[PDB]
Amino acid sequence: SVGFGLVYNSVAEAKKFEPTYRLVRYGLAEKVEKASRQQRKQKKNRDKKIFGTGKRLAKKVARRNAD
């Protein structure tokens, strides 16, 4: 078989130059807590509709609901 193998000066210096999945492949890293591509774009498009801190409006949109 034909394949490649790497050996760095140190594990951290390996970590700093190694792709994450290969690091996950050996347990050096792990699946990052993250959602799917479509879901993450949705919120970013949601965040494309939001400007500012938004609590005054968040309490405003809630407040229009009370009465």
Instruction: Tell the smallest beta-carbon distance from residue 2 to RNA (Å).
Output: 8
Output the CA–CA distances (angstroms, integers) from residue 62 to 34, 38, 48, 55, in the order listed: 29, 28, 20, 10
Q: Which is nearer to RNA, 16 or 59 (CB)?
A: 16
Residues from 5 through 64 that contact RNA (CB under 7 A): 16, 19, 21-22, 24-25, 36-38, 40-41
Cα distance between residue 25 and residue 36, in whole Å: 20
Site for RNA, rule CB under 7 A: 1, 3, 16, 19, 21-22, 24-25, 36-38, 40-41
